[PDB]
């Protein structure tokens, strides 16, 4: 029985021919005050998973601690911890989805929406969502909060169905993700211009880009808008 | 009289706890393991006996890690050692959860010391 205080907005992601990409801005809002500008909401787990989290930040920080523990505890009496018995995206997801649902069933949820993006050991892309209610779903594109409304329509024009995944390159995917992030800075009042993006590819592995900024914005047309109807000057 | 060595916590007339001393004997009947401290680290090594050719080589690992920075090796009843490490792990995690920094070695030592000593009280 709680209410979120410091919050993170959208986490968007989509899967492409050889991997998945996920991004989330670096803001931690306190209501309408864009309070903290250096919050990383993308959490890499090992070298094959990135968990993006929106929602309550104190709870995200808790989920972070939990993930670091899973890694420590999986290395225990595990000679193959950095190989065959390393944490897979599907393991990290199922674990989180379990916690989320248990917490909702005790009426004390972790006020978050999470997307686990990654690549399985056999090459399969993994992209799955889980939120404060334990609800889970998978799709070629996944976005939380505001991004579900504005990013999905855009990312879906690139990958509308399963067959479209093998026809999409990292270049195309990253371009779409980057554009969605710009649209969100335009229309989401709780967004930040600074963001992070992560690509998990079956060949090149994990590439994590920090300190990205929305660029190439169109604001010039504003010079010609005056009044709200009849004003001429 | 006699019998001072049938129950753990009992002090003998000379102040010894015979059950602890018999535990030591179980240790002396086991494989040798060592530790060497160096200019900026520590090294652990243990002798693993090959009871027969059927043992898959290099699979029955005996040295164990605690958290990500502690190594533990022991001689004696292997299971008791595992038990001891399981506690060390719970103890190291507890410390990290509350204090954020991984458990200092001197603090870890005492955590293990207090638990082991606890088993000589009853």
């Amino acid at each position: 029985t709680q209410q979120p205080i410091v919050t993170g907005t959208s986490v968007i992601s989509m899967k492409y021919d050889n991997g998945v990409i996920i991004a989330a801005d670096n803001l931690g809002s306190y209501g309408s005050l864009l309070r903290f500008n250096g919050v990383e909401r993308l959490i890499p787990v090992g070298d094959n998973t990135v968990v993006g989290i929106s929602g309550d930040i104190s709870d995200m920080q808790h989920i972070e601690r939990l993930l670091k523990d899973l890694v420590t505890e999986n290395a225990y009496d595990n000679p193959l911890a950095d190989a065959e018995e390393a944490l897979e995206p599907s393991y990290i997801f199922e674990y989180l989805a379990t916690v989320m649902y248990q917490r909702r069933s005790k009426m004390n949820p972790l006020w978050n929406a999470i997307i686990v993006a990654g690549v399985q050991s056999n090459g399969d892309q993994f992209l799955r969502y889980v939120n404060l209610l334990g609800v889970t779903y998978s799709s070629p594109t996944l976005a939380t909060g505001f991004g579900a409304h504005m990013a999905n329509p855009l990312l879906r024009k690139v990958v509308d169905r399963e067959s479209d995944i093998p026809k999409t390159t990292v270049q195309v995917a990253e371009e779409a993700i980057v554009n969605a992030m710009r649209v969100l800075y335009y229309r989401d009042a709780r967004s930040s211009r600074n963001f992070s993006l992560a690509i998990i590819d079956k060949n090149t592995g994990l590439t994590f880009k920090k300190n990205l900024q929305v660029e190439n914005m169109k604001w010039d047309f504003a010079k010609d808008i005056k009044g709200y109807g009849t004003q001429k000057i | 009289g006699t019998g001072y060595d049938l129950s753990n916590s009992v002090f003998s007339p000379d102040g010894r706890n015979f059950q602890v001393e018999y535990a030591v004997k179980a240790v002396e009947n086991g494989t040798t393991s060592i530790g060497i401290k160096c200019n900026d680290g520590v090294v652990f090594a243990v002798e693993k006996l090959i009871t027969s050719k059927l043992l898959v080589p290099q699979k029955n690992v005996k040295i164990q890690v605690v958290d990500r920075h502690i190594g533990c090796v022991y001689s004696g009843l292997i299971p008791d050692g595992r038990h001891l490490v399981n506690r060390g792990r719970e103890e190291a995690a507890s410390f990290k959860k509350l204090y954020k920094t991984p458990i200092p070695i001197p603090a870890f030592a005492d955590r293990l010391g207090q638990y082991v000593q606890a088993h000589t009280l009853y």
Side-chain angles (χ1 to χ4, degrees):
Chain A
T1 310
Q2 51 175 102
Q3 59 163 338
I5 309 286
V6 177
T7 46
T9 192
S10 309
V11 169
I12 66 178
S13 61
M14 70 184 290
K15 58 171 76 167
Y16 63 93
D17 66 2
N18 295 162
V20 294
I21 306 197
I22 185 176
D25 69 26
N26 303 337
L27 181 67
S29 310
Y30 187 74
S32 56
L33 167 65
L34 319 174
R35 206 170 180 177
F36 299 116
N37 288 115
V39 180
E40 178 58 64
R41 309 193 291 113
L42 290 190
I43 297 134
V45 185
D47 61 18
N48 67 163
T49 302
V50 170
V51 177
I53 304 175
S54 59
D56 185 280
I57 299 312
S58 59
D59 286 353
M60 175 189 83
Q61 290 185 341
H62 169 90
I63 290 168
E64 280 192 73
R65 194 181 65 62
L66 292 192
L67 292 173
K68 289 178 175 173
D69 253 74
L70 239 209
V71 171
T72 294
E73 200 101 10
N74 177 82
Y76 288 169
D77 310 327
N78 193 5
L80 302 178
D82 36 59
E84 283 115 320
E85 292 282 346
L87 288 169
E88 288 267 83
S90 58
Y91 301 163
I92 295 161
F93 181 80
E94 207 77 13
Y95 170 62
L96 289 184
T98 292
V99 174
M100 301 304 271
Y101 188 69
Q102 280 180 177
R103 293 286 299 260
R104 93 98 208 188
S105 298
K106 291 182 180 75
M107 298 296 287
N108 178 193
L110 285 166
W111 215 281
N112 302 106
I114 300 164
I115 292 177
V116 182
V119 187
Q120 298 287 91
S121 54
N122 67 345
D124 288 357
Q125 306 99 320
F126 183 91
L127 196 57
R128 199 158 174 99
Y129 166 107
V130 66
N131 68 17
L132 73 169
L133 300 171
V135 171
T136 64
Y137 44 79
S138 206
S139 195
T141 71
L142 285 181
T144 72
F146 210 94
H149 295 118
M150 303 189 84
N152 278 337
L154 291 177
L155 307 176
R156 290 178 174 160
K157 279 171 77 46
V158 180
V159 294
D160 200 35
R161 65 254 306 321
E162 215 75 31
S163 73
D164 289 341
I165 297 170
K167 305 174 178 178
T168 316
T169 68
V170 212
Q171 285 79 215
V172 168
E174 195 177 353
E175 179 167 64
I177 287 282
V178 180
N179 177 244
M181 293 300 295
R182 176 175 43 233
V183 176
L184 302 175
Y185 186 51
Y186 280 153
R187 319 310 292 223
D188 179 358
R190 307 299 184 246
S191 60
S192 178
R193 194 182 171 164
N194 307 112
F195 68 106
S196 296
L197 181 144
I199 305 177
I200 304 97
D201 187 87
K202 69 177 181 180
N203 300 318
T204 49
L206 190 147
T207 294
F208 191 90
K209 314 193 185 194
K210 275 178 158 280
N211 292 111
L212 269 37
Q213 260 219 149
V214 175
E215 307 285 8
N216 300 327
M217 290 186 296
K218 293 200 182 72
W219 284 96
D220 192 76
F221 63 94
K223 68 187 191 304
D224 306 316
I225 287 179
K226 53 239 168 195
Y228 43 79
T230 62
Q231 195 166 291
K232 283 173 171 176
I233 61 184
Chain B
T2 55
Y4 293 95
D5 64 323
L6 309 165
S7 264
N8 193 340
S9 56
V10 185
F11 278 115
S12 66
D14 54 321
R16 284 154 65 183
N17 177 2
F18 280 66
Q19 277 290 138
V20 162
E21 284 190 20
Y22 291 3
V24 176
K25 288 283 190 191
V27 181
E28 297 170 348
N29 184 249
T31 269
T32 148
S33 66
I34 54 165
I36 310 178
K37 173 182 180 179
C38 74
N39 62 183
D40 76 345
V42 283
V43 177
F44 302 97
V46 62
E47 156 196 13
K48 302 168 53 177
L49 291 182
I50 301 178
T51 307
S52 155
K53 281 254 178 176
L54 297 169
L55 265 63
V56 184
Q58 312 281 324
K59 294 286 187 290
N60 298 288
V61 191
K62 298 177 86 164
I63 305 191
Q64 289 180 298
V65 66
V66 171
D67 198 284
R68 282 134 90 137
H69 66 326
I70 295 170
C72 292
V73 75
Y74 39 77
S75 303
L77 295 171
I78 295 314
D80 282 26
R82 271 191 63 74
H83 180 65
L84 192 61
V85 172
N86 282 163
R87 172 73 179 204
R89 287 174 176 166
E90 301 179 356
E91 211 89 51
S94 169
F95 188 101
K96 204 178 203 174
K97 179 181 190 287
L98 183 61
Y99 310 120
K100 182 73 170 68
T101 179
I103 191 162
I105 316 295
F108 176 67
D110 204 51
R111 292 299 178 94
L112 287 196
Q114 302 283 0
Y115 185 70
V116 176
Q117 192 270 175
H119 287 65
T120 70
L121 294 171
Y122 315 104

